[PDB]
Amino acid sequence: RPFLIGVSGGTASGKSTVCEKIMELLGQNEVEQRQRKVVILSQDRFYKVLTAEQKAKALKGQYNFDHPDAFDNDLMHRTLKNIVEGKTVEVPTYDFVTHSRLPETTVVYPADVVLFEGILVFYSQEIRDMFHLRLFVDTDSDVRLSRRVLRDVRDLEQILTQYTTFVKPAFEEFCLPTKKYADVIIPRGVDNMVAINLIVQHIQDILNGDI
Amino acid sequence: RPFLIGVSGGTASGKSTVCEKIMELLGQNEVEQRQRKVVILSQDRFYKVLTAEQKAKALKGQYNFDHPDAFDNDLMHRTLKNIVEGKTVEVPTYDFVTHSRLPETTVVYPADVVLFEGILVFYSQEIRDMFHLRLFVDTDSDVRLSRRVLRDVRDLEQILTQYTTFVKPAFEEFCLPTKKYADVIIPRGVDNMVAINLIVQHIQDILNGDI
Amino acid sequence: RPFLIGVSGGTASGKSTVCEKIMELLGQNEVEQRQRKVVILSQDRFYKVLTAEQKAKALKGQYNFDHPDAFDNDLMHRTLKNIVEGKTVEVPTYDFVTHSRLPETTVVYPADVVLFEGILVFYSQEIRDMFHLRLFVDTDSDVRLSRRVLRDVRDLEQILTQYTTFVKPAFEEFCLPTKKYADVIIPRGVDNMVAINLIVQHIQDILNGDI
Amino acid sequence: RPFLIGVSGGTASGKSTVCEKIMELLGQNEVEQRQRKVVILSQDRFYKVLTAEQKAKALKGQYNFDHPDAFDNDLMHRTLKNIVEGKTVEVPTYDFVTHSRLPETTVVYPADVVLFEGILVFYSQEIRDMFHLRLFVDTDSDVRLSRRVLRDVRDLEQILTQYTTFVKPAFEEFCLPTKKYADVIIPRGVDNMVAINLIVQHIQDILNGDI
Ligand SMILES: Nc1ncnc2c1ncn2[C@@H]1O[C@H](COP(=O)(O)OP(=O)(O)O)[C@@H](O)[C@H]1O
Ligand SMILES: Nc1ncnc2c1ncn2[C@@H]1O[C@H](COP(=O)(O)OP(=O)(O)O)[C@@H](O)[C@H]1O
Ligand SMILES: Nc1ncnc2c1ncn2[C@@H]1O[C@H](COP(=O)(O)OP(=O)(O)O)[C@@H](O)[C@H]1O
Ligand SMILES: Nc1ncnc2c1ncn2[C@@H]1O[C@H](COP(=O)(O)OP(=O)(O)O)[C@@H](O)[C@H]1O
Numbered sequence A, B, C, D: 001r002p003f004l005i006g007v008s009g010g011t012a013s014g015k016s017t018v019c020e021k022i023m024e025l026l027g028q029n030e031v032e033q034r035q036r037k038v039v040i041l042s043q044d045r046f047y048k049v050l051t052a053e054q055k056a057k058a059l060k061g062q063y064n065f066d067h068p069d070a071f072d073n074d075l076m077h078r079t080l081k082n083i084v085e086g087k088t089v090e091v092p093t094y095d096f097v098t099h100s101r102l103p104e105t106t107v108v109y110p111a112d113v114v115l116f117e118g119i120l121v122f123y124s125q126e127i128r129d130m131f132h133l134r135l136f137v138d139t140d141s142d143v144r145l146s147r148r149v150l151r152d153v154r155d156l157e158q159i160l161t162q163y164t165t166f167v168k169p170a171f172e173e174f175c176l177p178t179k180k181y182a183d184v185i186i187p188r189g190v191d192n193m194v195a196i197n198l199i200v201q202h203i204q205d206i207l208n209g210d211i
Helices: A015-025 A052-059 A073-084 A141-151 A156-181 A193-208 B015-025 B052-059 B073-084 B141-151 B156-181 B193-208 C015-025 C052-059 C073-084 C141-151 C156-181 C193-208 D015-025 D052-059 D073-084 D141-151 D156-181 D193-208
Strands: A003-009 A038-042 A089-091 A106-108 A113-117 A133-138 A184-187 B003-009 B038-042 B089-091 B106-108 B113-117 B133-138 B184-187 C003-009 C038-042 C089-091 C106-108 C113-117 C133-138 C184-187 D003-009 D038-042 D089-091 D106-108 D113-117 D133-138 D184-187
Touching: A003 A015, A003 A073, A003 A156, A003 A193, A015 A038, A015 A113, A015 A193, A073 A089, A113 A193, A133 A156, A133 B193, A141 A156, A141 C141, A141 C156, A156 C141, A184 A193, A184 B193, A193 B133, A193 B184, A193 B193, B003 B015, B003 B073, B003 B156, B003 B193, B015 B038, B015 B113, B015 B193, B073 B089, B113 B193, B133 B156, B141 B156, B141 D141, B141 D156, B156 D141, B184 B193, C003 C015, C003 C073, C003 C156, C003 C193, C015 C038, C015 C113, C015 C193, C073 C089, C113 C193, C133 C156, C133 D193, C141 C156, C184 C193, C184 D193, C193 D133, C193 D184, C193 D193, D003 D015, D003 D073, D003 D156, D003 D193, D015 D038, D015 D113, D015 D193, D073 D089, D113 D193, D133 D156, D141 D156, D184 D193
Parallel strands: A003 A113, A003 A133, A038 A113, A133 A184, B003 B113, B003 B133, B038 B113, B133 B184, C003 C113, C003 C133, C038 C113, C133 C184, D003 D113, D003 D133, D038 D113, D133 D184
Antiparallel strands: A089 A106, A184 B184, B089 B106, C089 C106, C184 D184, D089 D106
């Protein structure tokens, strides 16, 4: 207590939407963040505040957000470490529209189960070993790219060039190799209701005190 | 009731040894086959009795046991179909040392959970849909070949030539594509105790009547 | 004489742009189609004229152009067969904007070398064996999808949904397996100038009569 | 002059047997090493002389010969560097039966073409860029393992355990990623006569002074 489930996989592999489904099925959606027993935590809350020079390149499409270094791993490891110790933590909120954290900060009170979703959430030895259960959402790259593209019409040519030069390699070099640390691999994502139901059942067991 | 879990994956991927582990952890080993609630059933019990001409080629290394046609799919589908209906079934025993069934025949009484392990156990639509949960033991081919080789010193040159000409293609053509039907993928095999424990817990839940 | 080089690979893998480069380097661009010794021939000239009902689905994004059946294989095989016999052929021109052939028709006079580029140009045994040399442009799917997308802004949501439901499977089922027939595999495409130069040199040798 | 062709690929992928075929077809076999114009050079001549403690582990199956560090890269780079400068070099001979170099040493006189075959022959930037043409023999791991096994009956259990714990990872980590540097990929190996003939023709062109 608390039971950490880590969920990795590529960008647009289905991590977020799977975790949401698990919160939805557990009914934890119908509850305010202070009252929850199961809570999702996203690694992408822990992006580093970019410098002038970094934000510069970020505008000109020339900055890599899929590299380990892109993430404030210390803040991350320290947060987790406190969550694990049963403490209330304040987590930041990143804005991709400005490439920086919001003034305000999310409180997360102790949970029984923590779903920790992120592209590089199994990259570091120290963090890997904190998880009781390790899930990897396996979704082919071309499928993921199509999801990501359609999801980012909120300009093509920047998005696509940024993918091929920075994202594709970073994925292959840092993210894909950590799949070997997965305990269970979940093909597809939110269409794998049998897989989700299996995980929900397991979370139900923990909560009910049957495990 | 009864809950069918199908487990596929390559030869020497770890299906048998994983299923054994699950029986061991559930304690179902310490019980006689008539008394069991969880029971393993192997597709490789359902190999066709070879003809003269077929057994001929089998000796001369020239017969393919990894092709769908190699299996008595009717007997198989009919057995399952009766198991599902809650009936006691008689299953055959194949002898690779003679390439034929033994005179005697194994009785399998109703179980609550049935673990059904086989290389092509998700090949046919009619059989796939019978399973409540579908597991695929993902173990790389070179690892599997090493297991199979070491496991078959009971002559190299026949085994290896038989692999490259008949087994490698049959695996790739018929077996590997059915991975897409897996609900949960289990990397490694019997070294994935977190995965096994998750499945055992789930089987425990069914048995206890918590699901 | 004439020397057939077949070039396959995925959509947007680089087949067309590689073949163009080879024509450019051989200088065959600076020559009218009647005067050429090296000529490119695209399988996508041989799409079937769609019916009313087929064109219907084509509009509603619901028709598969990456299936073997999508191509007029008879016309194709017959054309090739005549090219091989040293004859002048008339080839059709397809319009994706109307999903039908143009009234007019391209004449192709005997060449010494024929570059035959297509997604399924190694699918059929009868056609495979006509090629003296078989090239496969290997470019990862996510890279290809990005090329195809950017190349088809001439609407996202139709293009992307059409890819995932029809193109991704057809590629994997029919196209990717024919890579095993490739003699030489060319990673990347038009950025592989060493590979192209090797092929150009070889074409130069044939032409010069050094082979 | 001299034209370096580098050939990489896994152990038992077919590098050696392909290079031999190219020497055989060029007729360079029928010539003494001092008289040759085309010469093969194997990276596995450049293994480090093991220490007491290293040879110890080598006996007890516990030493990794597929790691970059396993090779005397300085000697290697220096040899190549001199070959490239048109000089006669002395190359060592390694004995796996004793894990050390032989007293005597092979002289290699200037060649016009040098075929340089090795598992990690594209690993280092400095060495990669020396090659005019870069070939990668792509042969699936299970096929390679079967070749290697049958080839090393000159004890199973040591060979197989040594593969899974040391060779499989080293291959995946160091060797397989360098495939991206290949100019041309040759599937299969010595059964790809069309590929070999293409390379032989090219070597013939260089020699004849047609390139
Ligand atoms: N079956 C599916 N599973 C998961 N995501 C899907 C599916 N179908 C479409 N999508 C879309 O793909 C994207 C997946 O990204 P998401 O799971 O939210 O982030 P990540 O995978 O990086 O955690 C979303 O925009 C989602 O709506
Ligand atoms: N970690 C492992 N998981 C599974 N099998 C292993 C493992 N390590 C060694 N083995 C051996 O590999 C072989 C696996 O074959 P098995 O699982 O019994 O058949 P199949 O995989 O065809 O169902 C066995 O001989 C087993 O002892
Ligand atoms: N290095 C490259 N090689 C090949 N095509 C490239 C490259 N970089 C960008 N492209 C673009 O990708 C697309 C490749 O498609 P093309 O080769 O013309 O068709 P196909 O690959 O289906 O034969 C083109 O739009 C081309 O301009
Ligand atoms: N078609 C083939 N191509 C290459 N090697 C083959 C083939 N068929 C069998 N073999 C055997 O596989 C092994 C390949 O190893 P080799 O090419 O000599 O070393 P490496 O691939 O490490 O350079 C050899 O023992 C060879 O006889």
